[PDB]
Amino acid sequence: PLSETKCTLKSFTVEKGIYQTSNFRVQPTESIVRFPNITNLCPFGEVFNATRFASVYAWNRKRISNCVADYSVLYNSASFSTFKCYGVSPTKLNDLCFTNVYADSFVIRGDEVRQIAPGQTGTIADYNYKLPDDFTGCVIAWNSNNLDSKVGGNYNYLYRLFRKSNLKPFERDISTEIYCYFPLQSYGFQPTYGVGYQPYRVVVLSFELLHAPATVCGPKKSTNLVKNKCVNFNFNGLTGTGVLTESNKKFLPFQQFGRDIADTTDAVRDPQTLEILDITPCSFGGVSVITPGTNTSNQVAVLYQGVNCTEVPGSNVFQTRAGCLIGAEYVNNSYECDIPIGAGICASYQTSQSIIAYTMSLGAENSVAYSNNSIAIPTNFTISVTTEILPVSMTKTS
Amino acid sequence: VDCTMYICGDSTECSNLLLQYGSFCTQLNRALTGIAVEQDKNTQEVFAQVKQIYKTPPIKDFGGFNFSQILPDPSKPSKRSFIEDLLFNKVTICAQKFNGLTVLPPLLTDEMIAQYTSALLAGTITSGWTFGAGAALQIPFAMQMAYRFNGIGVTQNVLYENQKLIANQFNSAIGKIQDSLSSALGKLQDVVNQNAQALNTLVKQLSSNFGAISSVLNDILSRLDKVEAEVQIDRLITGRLQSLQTYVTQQLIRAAEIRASANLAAIKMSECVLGQSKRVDFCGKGYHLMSFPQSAPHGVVFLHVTYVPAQEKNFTTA
Amino acid sequence: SECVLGQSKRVDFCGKGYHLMSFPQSAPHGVVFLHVTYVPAQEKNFTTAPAICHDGKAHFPREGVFVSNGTHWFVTQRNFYEPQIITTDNTFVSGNCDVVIGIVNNTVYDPLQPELDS
Amino acid sequence: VDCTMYICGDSTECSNLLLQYGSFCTQLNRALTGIAVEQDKNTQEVFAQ
Ligand SMILES: *[C@@H]1O[C@H](CO[C@@H]2O[C@@H](C)[C@@H](O)[C@@H](O)[C@@H]2O)[C@@H](O[C@@H]2O[C@H](CO)[C@@H](O)[C@H](O)[C@H]2NC(C)=O)[C@H](O)[C@H]1NC(C)=O
Ligand SMILES: *[C@@H]1O[C@H](CO)[C@@H](O[C@@H]2O[C@H](CO)[C@@H](O)[C@H](O)[C@H]2NC(C)=O)[C@H](O)[C@H]1NC(C)=O
Ligand SMILES: *[C@@H]1O[C@H](CO)[C@@H](O[C@@H]2O[C@H](CO)[C@@H](O)[C@H](O)[C@H]2NC(C)=O)[C@H](O)[C@H]1NC(C)=O
Ligand SMILES: *[C@@H]1O[C@H](CO)[C@@H](O[C@@H]2O[C@H](CO)[C@@H](O)[C@H](O)[C@H]2NC(C)=O)[C@H](O)[C@H]1NC(C)=O
Ligand SMILES: *[C@@H]1O[C@H](CO)[C@@H](O[C@@H]2O[C@H](CO)[C@@H](O)[C@H](O)[C@H]2NC(C)=O)[C@H](O)[C@H]1NC(C)=O
Ligand SMILES: *[C@@H]1O[C@H](CO)[C@@H](O)[C@H](O)[C@H]1NC(C)=O
Ligand SMILES: *[C@@H]1O[C@H](CO)[C@@H](O)[C@H](O)[C@H]1NC(C)=O
Ligand SMILES: *[C@@H]1O[C@H](CO)[C@@H](O)[C@H](O)[C@H]1NC(C)=O
Ligand SMILES: *[C@@H]1O[C@H](CO)[C@@H](O)[C@H](O)[C@H]1NC(C)=O
Ligand SMILES: *[C@@H]1O[C@H](CO)[C@@H](O)[C@H](O)[C@H]1NC(C)=O
């Protein structure tokens, strides 16, 4: 602790005092994982391996839910070519659970693919498929010139050419009344086209992360649960460090989390036993080193502020109301305050020398011997000359 | 405030980003610690003006003046007066605690402050102003009151000739103070309100996004990979650090206001309790006789006793 | 202003004890006031009374306090024991003896008496 | 000061962006109101003796 004061004060001498150095923090004994116990593998096959896709004016939203996913299959297999994941990482995607997943599917030109991102405009974005500003999801697309063209032309892939106003995000509009023009037009796809005019199949996985119980989750397997002990945890994605305690908080059957004023999560429903657990944090506080002057002694005592002496990981240990004090001995005598610890306790270097801690004396105690017919009158005087020092100015800076 | 636990919390990833701002957490902790040491300085210089802990005698023969409501209550171990108990009742954490905020105990306990007010009051009623100048020289209470009267330019015979009336008026006025406090402490209440309100604001600013996809930092760390996460965390760091700097600046200005009020109270202790004041309205309305200090939560109550002229008559003068 | 350019009646404002005078000394970025104060010492207990009853008059001290040494009554200044005989010139009359709690009986000297006698 | 009319003015778009910073406009208006009430208090205690 003395070296830590020297290093926090950036000085090789330390003067007499109590110095806050560093913060104590108890650490997680293990990493719990608790997840939905869902066996059903998610049916993404019947989008990525559908025979024929929809036209992008008529883009199709397959709901994926109450299933277990593995997006490392979709990613690392890398038969694809573009895989832009917005608001979620392609990797941490396997470590997370989603309330629903919506798979949005269509075919477009390899040029016009560059329009399908949040905050974009153009033929496809304006009239066919618009991604919202706060979209969470992965745009996955791959070349399909093996299936979606022919010599003499394929004409299967219609897009809306005209609308009275641009689409809203995720708006679907399959209307065909004349705009004069028929409002739809189609890609003539031939094999001999260049990379940008060839067809590409697109599947956009629109994730959502609502307060509902998450129904899709990645492949990780739940651990056992331990209590009245500090742990790291993952609970359907809710991740933190805490002393999981059996909660008496009376959650209504729809509720999954409980929250603090800071929007930390205060209690959680177990995703398998459905019990409620408190997540009070693993304990912490400032560490203050009581030191005499280093020109007096290298011997030091340490105060774990607010921490209870049962918690701190030693020849003397004393529980002040300011916190646990280690390495100073409580003496029942009382003296003038030397180093203030707090809550009536002060510490000093005294006899064989060591740091004592003690209740401070406010002063010597006197009974004035008042009586209804007694007066004390001074028969002499002393002339006292005392110094009072006041600051008046400080160093002028520009 | 553990600035790192406030801004980042448990995350090492955020702690590494936060280090790139350098000293700002040290500046914040150092400023808040300086404010904290100043609160013990304020209490020390107000209450610890007495060299010795004076005790009152067992026979309270103070000439008809009845200090029982303001002297220490013998029936309690807390050694507070009846009026001090009224004052403590007339003013008197998890959400703050869990988010890196800690409230430290005062160095002097409420019992120690009540023991200083006990010493000041015992010295006053047993010895007048003498215990401020030097030794507590005993004098009978009616005679020190007679020299208070002489100080306000009223000849001491007026005190002795009307002594039982003056005692009845004093006792009655203390009774009215007891009832007034039982019915009062706006200045102390406001300081507690402001500090609680500032901390509630500092906690609630943890919910704010500041443009990040979420305010809950372990969302981002469960959900984005490093180079994309770092942009979001730098937004959270920036706004949380600006919330902390706002808090600590307002606490430095509140600290100066309370420091001024503590300096004033230390002056009032010296000039009204340890002495009699010729300064108009400094120790209550009317000509000052004497004042009694009473402890209050985070503050001091002076009971100022003053001579107020009454029932005037017209006269021709030359 | 109040300690150097003047003498202060304000308690503890210009040091502990009764202020006599103060001296300024310059310091780096600030000022040192050397405060000179009278601090009372070597006190003695005395029996005291508010008034002397003489010839049915109550006498009170003009600028002092009544004290007794065990046998005799004296008037003295509050802050330095200088005992003087109780006389018509250092006391003032107000009313009869019955109204004051704790009046005591002693003669009050009149210096005009032995002068008229001489 | 209306912190919103100062920072954003008439714009709803800016107002929605500003809400993401949370309490700061409330803190500012509260501080300026406390300063304002103190000026009446200053006049009261000087002249209403
Ligand atoms: C002044 O006298 C007091 C005692 O009071 C006096 O004696 C009483 C019997 C009664 O006549 C009162 O009216 C008087 O005022 C002295 O106090 C005591 O001192 C002794 C040591 O000599 C000590 O052991 C006792 O504890 C003291 N009494 C109490 C109640 O604490 C005091 O010392 C005298 N002071 C001076 C300066 O002479
Ligand atoms: C320090 O912590 C211990 C727990 O480790 C506290 O002990 C409990 O105290 C309560 C009363 O406050 C009792 O009802 C419990 O039975 C105690 N538990 C045990 C295991 O003994 C103790 O009170 C704490 N002390 C301080 C000063 O914080
Ligand atoms: C001082 O005042 C209190 C009241 O404020 C007096 O208290 C009374 O004391 C008697 C016994 O002496 C009790 O029977 C009463 O019930 C008490 N009244 C209250 C309201 O508590 C006390 O007697 C007074 N003492 C002196 C010396 O005047
Ligand atoms: C109180 O003081 C008086 C003096 O003012 C003392 O009286 C004198 O006593 C001495 C002997 O000790 C005599 O020689 C004087 O003639 C006395 N003078 C008068 C005027 O009587 C008195 O003794 C003192 N009492 C005590 C108890 O000390
Ligand atoms: C103080 O002195 C007065 C006289 O000046 C005393 O009063 C007299 O007391 C006696 C009884 O002892 C009566 O017969 C007289 O009539 C009283 N005279 C007057 C003028 O009232 C008084 O008793 C003395 N008191 C003490 C304690 O010595
Ligand atoms: C599509 O089907 C083939 C087998 O015909 C398989 O190898 C591939 O992994 C499937 N892709 C997806 C995304 O399911
Ligand atoms: C999930 O696991 C629990 C045991 O932890 C079991 O009781 C429950 O039946 C499982 N869920 C289903 C749908 O079977
Ligand atoms: C260190 O302590 C010694 C007394 O043991 C003293 O003489 C010396 O001046 C001190 N040095 C400093 C720098 O305080
Ligand atoms: C202090 O006093 C208590 C009794 O109040 C006693 O039990 C304890 O042993 C004492 N400790 C020391 C170090 O004297
Ligand atoms: C002092 O108190 C006693 C009772 O203890 C009383 O008899 C005496 O008359 C009182 N003296 C004065 C001067 O009031």
Author numbering:
A (entry chain A): 295 to 473, 488 to 621, 639 to 676, 689 to 735
B (entry chain B): 736 to 827, 850 to 940, 944 to 1078
C (entry chain A): 1030 to 1147
D (entry chain C): 736 to 784
Would you copy out the relevant sentences from the publication that reported this structure?
S glycoprotein trimers protrude out from the viral membrane and are the major proteins on the viral surface, making it the main target for vaccine design. Sequential cleavage of S at the S1/S2 site followed by the S2’ site within the S2 domain exposes the fusion peptide (FP), which mediates host-viral membrane fusion, allowing entry of the viral genome into the host cell. Overall, the S-trimer structures are similar to those previously determined for B.1 in situ, and are similar across all variants.
Gamma (P681), retaining the proline at position 681, shows cleavage at levels similar to B.1. In addition, the Gamma variant differs in the NTD next to D138Y, in the receptor binding site in RBD (next to E484K and N501Y), and in the HR2 helix bundle, all of which are known to be heterogeneous in S structure. Delta (34 ± 14) and Mu (35 ± 16) had more prefusion S trimers per virion than B.1 (20 ± 10); Alpha (23 ± 12) and Gamma (27 ± 13) had similar numbers of prefusion S trimers as B.1. Taking the virion diameter into account, the density of S trimers (per 1000 nm2 surface area) in Gamma (1.5 ± 0.6), Delta (1.9 ± 0.9), and Mu (1.9 ± 0.7) is higher than in B.1. Of note, B.1 which appeared and became dominant early in the pandemic, and from which all variants tested here are descendants of, removed an interaction between K854 and D614, which may also favor these transitions. In addition, our structures show that residues 852–855 at the end of the FPPR adopt an α-helix conformation in all the other variants (Gamma, Delta, and Mu), indicating that it is the Alpha A570D mutation that favors the helix-to-strand switch.
